C-alpha cells in the first residue's frame, strides 16, 4: 500500500463511507468486466487497511479498484484504480 491510497481510505472512513473492492484480469479489464472481492465489513482504520493489503496480495497481476460506498443510498461515492499487473 502507498501513502496516496492510505490518505483516501482515511478520508472516506472519516466521512463514514464503507470501503469496497473489485478485481479484473488483464483481459476482463479491457472490456470493463469487474468481479467483486471479499467484502471489508469494518469501520476501524487498522482493520480496513489490513484487509486491503490482504486483498491486493490475493489478486496479484490483476487490476484492483477501490470503492467508496455510501451505505444509506447504496451508491458508489468513489472509484480509484489502486493496483495494476506490473
Amino acid at each position: 500500500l502507498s501513502s496516496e491510497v492510505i490518505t483516501q481510505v482515511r478520508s472516506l472512513l472519516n466521512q463514514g463511507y464503507r470501503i469496497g473492492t473489485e478485481h479484473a484480469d488483464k483481459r476482463r479489464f479491457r472490456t470493463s468486466s469487474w468481479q467483486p472481492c471479499a467484502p471489508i465489513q469494518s469501520t476501524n482504520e487498522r482493520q480496513v487497511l489490513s484487509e486491503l493489503e490482504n486483498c491486493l496480495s490475493e489478486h496479484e497481476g490483476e487490476y484492483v479498484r477501490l470503492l467508496g460506498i455510501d451505505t444509506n443510498t447504496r451508491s458508489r461515492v468513489f472509484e480509484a484504480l489502486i493496483q495494476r499487473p506490473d
Partner: protein, 440 residues
C-alpha cells in the same frame, strides 16, 4: 475571471465532459487567470454582463477549470483541465461538441497558443451516438478474416488512369492476396475518370479476384462528394454493385456529412473506411491546434469502421490506437491519454497504418499494432519488380510468416529479419521483394 471559473477544489462529475488544453500565456498573464479564461471563453464568458443573464441560472452552464499544471521540461507552457456540464451539448452531434469547445477559445488574445490535447466523453453522452456502423468484431465476421491484420493497397498513380486501367490494377493487386484496395483521397469524379465508371470497373475487378482466390475482396470506393445528395448517390450505387466497403474524407467533407453517411452505412450494412486527409493542418504543431487523438475519439462517435492512424511519437500512437479499439482506457500520460475513457460497449474502430512501408517493416508493424489493424502498402505492392500480383503475394507471405512466428513465440524485433529471410527461401515473390527494398 479567476474567482468564478478557476475552481481547483472541484471534483468532476461522471456526467461532465472534460477537456485537456495545452496553453502558453502571453507574457504578463499568469497561468491561473489564463486557465480560467479558457474555461470562460469556451463556455459562457463575455466582456459585459447583460440583464437577460438574470433570467437564467448562470452557474449551471459554466465551464470550470479544476486543474492547472506546468508542462514538464517546457517553459511558459501549462495544461488546463476544464469540466463542462452535460446540458451544454446537443445529443448525438460531434458538430455541436466541437462548436462548443473549440468554437472560440483558439482565437483568445491573452493566450499565445492553444492546443486541445484530450476530451473525456461521459457515458451519458456516448450513448446518444451511433458509433461505428459495424466495429472491429462485426467486420471480421462479415469478411471471414481472423487472426491477422488486414492488407490494403492504394492504386498509383493518384490521377491519370482510365476507369478500365484502374480496375485492371485493382484486379491484379487483389488476386495476389491483398484484402483491400483503395481509391486515393483526391480521386472523386474528375474528367479523366468519372466516379460511376470507376465504381463499375472496380466492382468487376472485385468479382474476378474473389472468384479466383475464394477469399472476400473489397476496394474502398471514395464516395466523398460536393453535396450530401451526390454522396448518397455514390454510396447507393456502391451498394447496388454489392460492394462491402466505402471511403470518406471526414475532415474535408465535414462531420455532418460523415454522420449522415455512417447512419446510412449502418442501415445498409456497408463498411465505412475513413481517410484523415487535411489532418496535419490541425494536428501537426505541438503548440497550437487539435491533437489527432481528439479527432479520432470524435470519429469513433460519428461513425467509421476504419481510420488512418499513421505508421511509426510512438507512445502517443499506441495511446490513441487503444482509444479507438478498446472499451476501457486508463489514463496514462506517457502514452498521451489524459483522461480515463469508457466507451460503454460502443464498438472499436480498426486503425489503418499507411505510408512508405514495405516487407521489411512487416515484423515491426505486427508487433506494434497486432491483429486488429489494416496495413497499407501503396508502393510496397505496385513497386515490386514483377508487378502488382506477385507484389501482393510478397506482402501477404511476409505478413503470414510474421503472424505465424509471433504465435510460435518468436521475438519479432530480434528475429524479424530471419523470419522474412527464411520465408524468402520458399517464396520467390518475397525473395524478389526482400532484394529490392533494403532492410530497416
Amino acid at each position: 475571471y479567476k474567482l468564478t471559473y478557476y475552481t481547483p477544489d472541484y471534483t468532476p462529475k461522471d456526467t461532465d465532459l472534460l477537456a485537456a488544453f495545452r496553453f502558453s500565456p502571453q507574457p504578463g498573464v499568469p497561468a491561473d487567470e489564463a486557465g480560467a479564461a479558457i474555461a470562460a471563453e469556451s463556455s459562457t464568458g463575455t466582456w459585459t454582463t447583460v440583464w437577460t443573464d438574470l433570467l437564467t441560472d448562470m452557474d449551471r452552464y459554466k465551464g470550470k477549470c479544476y486543474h492547472i499544471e506546468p508542462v514538464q521540461g517546457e517553459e511558459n507552457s501549462y495544461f488546463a483541465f476544464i469540466a463542462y456540464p452535460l446540458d451544454l451539448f446537443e445529443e448525438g452531434s460531434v458538430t455541436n461538441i466541437l462548436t462548443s469547445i473549440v468554437g472560440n477559445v483558439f482565437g483568445f488574445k491573452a493566450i499565445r497558443s492553444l492546443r486541445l490535447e484530450d476530451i473525456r466523453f461521459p457515458v451519458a453522452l456516448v450513448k446518444t451516438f451511433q458509433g461505428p456502423p459495424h466495429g472491429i468484431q462485426v467486420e471480421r465476421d462479415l469478411l471471414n478474416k481472423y487472426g491477422r491484420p488486414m492488407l490494403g493497397c492504394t492504386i498509383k498513380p493518384k490521377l491519370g488512369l482510365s476507369a478500365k486501367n484502374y480496375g485492371r490494377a485493382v484486379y491484379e493487386c487483389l488476386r495476389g492476396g491483398l484484402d483491400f484496395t483503395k481509391d486515393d483521397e483526391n480521386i472523386n469524379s474528375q474528367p479523366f475518370q468519372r466516379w460511376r465508371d470507376r465504381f463499375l470497373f472496380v466492382a468487376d475487378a472485385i468479382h474476378k479476384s474473389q472468384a479466383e482466390t475464394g477469399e472476400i475482396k473489397g476496394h474502398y470506393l471514395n464516395v466523398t462528394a460536393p453535396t450530401c445528395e451526390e454522396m448518397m448517390k455514390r454510396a447507393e450505387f456502391a451498394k447496388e454493385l454489392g460492394m462491402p466497403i466505402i471511403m470518406h474524407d471526414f475532415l474535408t467533407a465535414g462531420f455532418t456529412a460523415n454522420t449522415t453517411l455512417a447512419k446510412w452505412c449502418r442501415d445498409n450494412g456497408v463498411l465505412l473506411h475513413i481517410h484523415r486527409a487535411m489532418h496535419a493542418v490541425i494536428d501537426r504543431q505541438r503548440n497550437h491546434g487539435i491533437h489527432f487523438r481528439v479527432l479520432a475519439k470524435c470519429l469513433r462517435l460519428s461513425g467509421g469502421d476504419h481510420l488512418h492512424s499513421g505508421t511509426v511519437d510512438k507512445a502517443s500512437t499506441l495511446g490513441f490506437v487503444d482509444l479507438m479499439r478498446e472499451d476501457h482506457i486508463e489514463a496514462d500520460r506517457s502514452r498521451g491519454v489524459f483522461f480515463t475513457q469508457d466507451w460503454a460497449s460502443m464498438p472499436g474502430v480498426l486503425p489503418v497504418a499507411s505510408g512508405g512501408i514495405h516487407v521489411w517493416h512487416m515484423p515491426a508493424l505486427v508487433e506494434i499494432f497486432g491483429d486488429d489493424s489494416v496495413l497499407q502498402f501503396g508502393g510496397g505492392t505496385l513497386g515490386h519488380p514483377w508487378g502488382n500480383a506477385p507484389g501482393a503475394t510478397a506482402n501477404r507471405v511476409a505478413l503470414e510468416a510474421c503472424v505465424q512466428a509471433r504465435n510460435e513465440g518468436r521475438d519479432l524485433y530480434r528475429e524479424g529479419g530471419d523470419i522474412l529471410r527464411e520465408a524468402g527461401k520458399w517464396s520467390p515473390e518475397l525473395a524478389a521483394a526482400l532484394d529490392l527494398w533494403k532492410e530497416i
